[PDB]
Amino acid sequence: RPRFSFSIAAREGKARTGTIEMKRGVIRTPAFMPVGTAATVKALKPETVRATGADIILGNTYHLMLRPGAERIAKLGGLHSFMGWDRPILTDSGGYQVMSLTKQSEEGVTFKMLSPERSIEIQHLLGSDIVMAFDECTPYPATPSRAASSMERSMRWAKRSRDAFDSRKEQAENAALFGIQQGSVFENLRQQSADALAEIGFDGYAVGGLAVGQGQDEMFRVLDFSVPMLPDDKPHYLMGVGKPDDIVGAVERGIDMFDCVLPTRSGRNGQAFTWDGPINIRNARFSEDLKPLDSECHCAVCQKWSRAYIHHLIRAGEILGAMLMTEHNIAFYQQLMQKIRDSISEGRFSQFAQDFRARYFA
Amino acid sequence: RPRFSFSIAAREGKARTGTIEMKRGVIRTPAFMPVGTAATVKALKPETVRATGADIILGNTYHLMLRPGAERIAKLGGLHSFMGWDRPILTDSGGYQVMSLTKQSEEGVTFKMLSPERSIEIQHLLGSDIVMAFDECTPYPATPSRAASSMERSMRWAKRSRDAFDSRKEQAENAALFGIQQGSVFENLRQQSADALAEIGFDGYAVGGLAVGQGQDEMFRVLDFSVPMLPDDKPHYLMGVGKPDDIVGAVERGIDMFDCVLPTRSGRNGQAFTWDGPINIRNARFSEDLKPLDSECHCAVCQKWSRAYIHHLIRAGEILGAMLMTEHNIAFYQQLMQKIRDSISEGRFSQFAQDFRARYFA
Numbered sequence: 101r102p103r104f105s106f107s108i109a110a111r112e113g114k115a116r117t118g119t120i121e122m123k124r125g126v127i128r129t130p131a132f133m134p135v136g137t138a139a140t141v142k143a144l145k146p147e148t149v150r151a152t153g154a155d156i157i158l159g160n161t162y163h164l165m166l167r168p169g170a171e172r173i174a175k176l177g178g179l180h181s182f183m184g185w186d187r188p189i190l191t192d193s194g195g196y197q198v199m200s201l202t203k204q205s206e207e208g209v210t211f212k213m214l215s216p217e218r219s220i221e222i223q224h225l226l227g228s229d230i231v232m233a234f235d236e237c238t239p240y241p242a243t244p245s246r247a248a249s250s251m252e253r254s255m256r257w258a259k260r261s262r263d264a265f266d267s268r269k270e271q272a273e274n275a276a277l278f279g280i281q282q283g284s285v286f287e288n289l290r291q292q293s294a295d296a297l298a299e300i301g302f303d304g305y306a307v308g309g310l311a312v313g314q315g316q317d318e319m320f321r322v323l324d325f326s327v328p329m330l331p332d333d334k335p336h337y338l339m340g341v342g343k344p345d346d347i348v349g350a351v352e353r354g355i356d357m358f359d360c361v362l363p364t365r366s367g368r369n370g371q372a373f374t375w376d377g378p379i380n381i382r383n384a385r386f387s388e389d390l391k392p393l394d395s396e397c398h399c400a401v402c403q404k405w406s407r408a409y410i411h412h413l414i415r416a417g418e419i420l421g422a423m424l425m426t427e428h429n430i431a432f433y434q435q436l437m438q439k440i441r442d443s444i445s446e447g448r449f450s451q452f453a454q455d456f457r458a459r460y461f462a
Numbered sequence: 463r464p465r466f467s468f469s470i471a472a473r474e475g476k477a478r479t480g481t482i483e484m485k486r487g488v489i490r491t492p493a494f495m496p497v498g499t500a501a502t503v504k505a506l507k508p509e510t511v512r513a514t515g516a517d518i519i520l521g522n523t524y525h526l527m528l529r530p531g532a533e534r535i536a537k538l539g540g541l542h543s544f545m546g547w548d549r550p551i552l553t554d555s556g557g558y559q560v561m562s563l564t565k566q567s568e569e570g571v572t573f574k575m576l577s578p579e580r581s582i583e584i585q586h587l588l589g590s591d592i593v594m595a596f597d598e599c600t601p602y603p604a605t606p607s608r609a610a611s612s613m614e615r616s617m618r619w620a621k622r623s624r625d626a627f628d629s630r631k632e633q634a635e636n637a638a639l640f641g642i643q644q645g646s647v648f649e650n651l652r653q654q655s656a657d658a659l660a661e662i663g664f665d666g667y668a669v670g671g672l673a674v675g676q677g678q679d680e681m682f683r684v685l686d687f688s689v690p691m692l693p694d695d696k697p698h699y700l701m702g703v704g705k706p707d708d709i710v711g712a713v714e715r716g717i718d719m720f721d722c723v724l725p726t727r728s729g730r731n732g733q734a735f736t737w738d739g740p741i742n743i744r745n746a747r748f749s750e751d752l753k754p755l756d757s758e759c760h761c762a763v764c765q766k767w768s769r770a771y772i773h774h775l776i777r778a779g780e781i782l783g784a785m786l787m788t789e790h791n792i793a794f795y796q797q798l799m800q801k802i803r804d805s806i807s808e809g810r811f812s813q814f815a816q817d818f819r820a821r822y823f824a
């Protein structure tokens with residue numbers, strides 16, 4: 101396999117399905133990336149993550165550079181070996197969390213320094229397969245002046261990220277680099293940003309700044325004009341999105357890649373995804389319900405345990421409850437992505453989306 | 463398979479190895495029973511418990527009758543179906559926890575009623591394979607007068623337990639009933655108790671009251687005279703024991719069955735069992751240690767992850783840390799029991815025990 105090769109096999113409207121080939125494996129697109137926050141997808145063995153159908157996972161840079169540390173992970177053999185996941189890993193740059201969980205300057209951010217060069221070096225030390233440019237995730241809402249200033253800095257940072265990555269032979273030969281579009285909800289700033297990014301040149305293009313408070317209507321509105329601005333022949337990654345219906349609508353608008361903590365975090369808190377919508381398994385109505393979490397789901401959890409048992413586990417605060425809920429939720433997300441890929445491949449994705457929404461929202 | 467058949471295949475001194483055949487499967491003896499407190503072996507799928515080599519697990523009656531409730535579990539298909547463990551389950555009577563986690567009377571105990579008849583009915587509702595007589599676990603230390611009064615009540619309760627079990631056709635035909643010897647640390651009271659129990663007649667005999675504060679020397683002293691009092695041709699179960707070295711010494715004194723929460727509870731708190739003794743994986747010395755938890759262990763955890771990674775997980779409070787530590791610890795206990803069975807079968811158990819202790823304590 102090549103360092104990086106994105107191929108589109110089928111299209112329907114703005115939707116695409118295809119593959120990203122990388123040295124550590126193939127990613128089927130549209131792709132959902134489970135989030136591993138501190139070198140673990142919470143409550144799952146990596147074999148279990150794979151078993152659900154995930155082709156790639158996301159690691160957060162901010163958390164790893166703090167614990168256990170990037171240099172330490174590198175000394176230990178890199179993140180794949182450390183955590184036991186041998187397939188592609190996408191790492192974020194750290195740019196988001198350093199502000200949400202500071203001294204900001206043109207150089208980077210100081211907190212209790214992270215900069216483009218340090219972020220790219222940390223992602224190298226981790227042995228990341230897909231490296232995110234170090235950016236600034238503009239808060240929502242933002243005035244046009246502030247969003248412009250923020251976007252402009254991010255684009256200067258994107259060039260610095262590009263050069264830092266290219267300056268390291270082994271990273272440039274074995275990993276890929278994605279740029280991140282900003283500009284808040286403003287069309288002209290999104291265009292400026294896309295333009296800047298394309299001029300630099302990246303292996304893929306994320307749509308940043310849309311998982312930070314916008315309602316779905318608004319996020320969709322911004323995607324409508326923003327995704328066509330990106331190079332068509334490269335993957336499009338919507339950072340931090342989202343709910344099952346967010347994902348369907350974003351694929352309808354040309355997104356190829358997704359991540360979000362909802363299936364893991366929700367799962368631990370008792371929310372299970374079903375084709376008829378989410379359910380809160382702690383609800384007393386499930387106390388004697390012998391059905392699986394979802395009537396159609398092919399996951400191991402639905403093959404073996406009832407709602408009643410998982411209800412008991414979550415109410416009791418049992419670790420196995422977190423494990424079972426998380427596995428099901430991640431499997432549900434993967435089955436959603438499989439249904440999306442198959443329906444685009446068959447030219448019936450628009451119908452799938454309609455059908456999905458009618459039932460999920462009933 | 464028969465309802466119950468205990469066969470001794472090999473002996474060495476007081477040590478025995480053999481099998482208990484039951485309708486739901488075969489139990490290899492000496493046996494270690496992982497404890498499932500609220501219908502789950504904490505942080506493990508039942509398939510994982512089996513994978514470690516466990517033939518039977520223990521369920522606590524007290525906790526189940528409180529949550530989710532015995533009648534409810536029965537309505538749901540019984541405990542095996544509920545939790546997804548299809549092999550034998552031994553349940554305790556509830557007698558211990560109702561006092562440690564009250565109004566005591568000859569009838570039973572009232573708390574925020576449990577009695578012999580109710581305890582046996584609850585264990586039936588759960589669908590237990592091995593039912594423990596409802597007893598009183600005498601506190602340690604106890605004066606001889608108090609231990610005698612306590613033991614005497616337990617023996618009256620043992621007869622009531624016997625009759626309650628026999629009065630239910632399906633339970634008597636499909637499960638087994640164990641009696642529990644009391645008498646604190648006193649030889650004459652242990653003899654009285656054994657005598658009473660044998661007169662009633664049980665399928666197996668537990669040694670109760672020795673996991674409640676006695677040091678090893680004392681526990682061993684009491685086992686020395688207590689186990690020979692029990693019927694030779696029935697299993698001998700030491701409730702609540704114990705550490706790896708407790709278990710070796712107790713097999714040397716004729717015990718066939720063990721349970722304790724140490725491998726699970728310890729595991730979650732960062733203690734890992736090794737042939738060179740326990741280690742506390744949170745210790746900074748493991749932060750860059752690439753070795754497995756134990757150099758010889760055949761478990762899945764030691765095949766795949768390093769001390770360094772598990773150290774990170776436990777320090778980070780990650781669920782996967784609890785899962786990995788627990789799997790290893792339960793696998794270690796099972797490998798210990800396998801080594802014990804093989805060495806008795808080969809007539810080299812005395813040497814094994816010597817060798818085990820020299821290394822575990824070095």
Ligand SMILES: CCCCc1nc2c(=O)[nH][nH]c(=O)c2[nH]1
Nearest residue numbers: 192193196237308309311339340
């Ligand atoms: C709460 C979800 C946040 C998702 C996210 N957005 C962004 C972004 O806009 N830029 N850089 C990032 O790492 C990033 N991560």
Ligand SMILES: CCCCc1nc2c(=O)[nH][nH]c(=O)c2[nH]1
Nearest residue numbers: 554555558599670671673701702
């Ligand atoms: C803290 C470990 C307690 C083990 C135990 N001992 C006993 C006993 O002596 N009688 N009945 C029981 O259920 C029981 N359980």
Ligand SMILES: [Zn+2]
Nearest residue numbers: 397399402428
């Ligand atoms: Zn499922």
Ligand SMILES: [Zn+2]
Nearest residue numbers: 759761764790
């Ligand atoms: Zn191990």
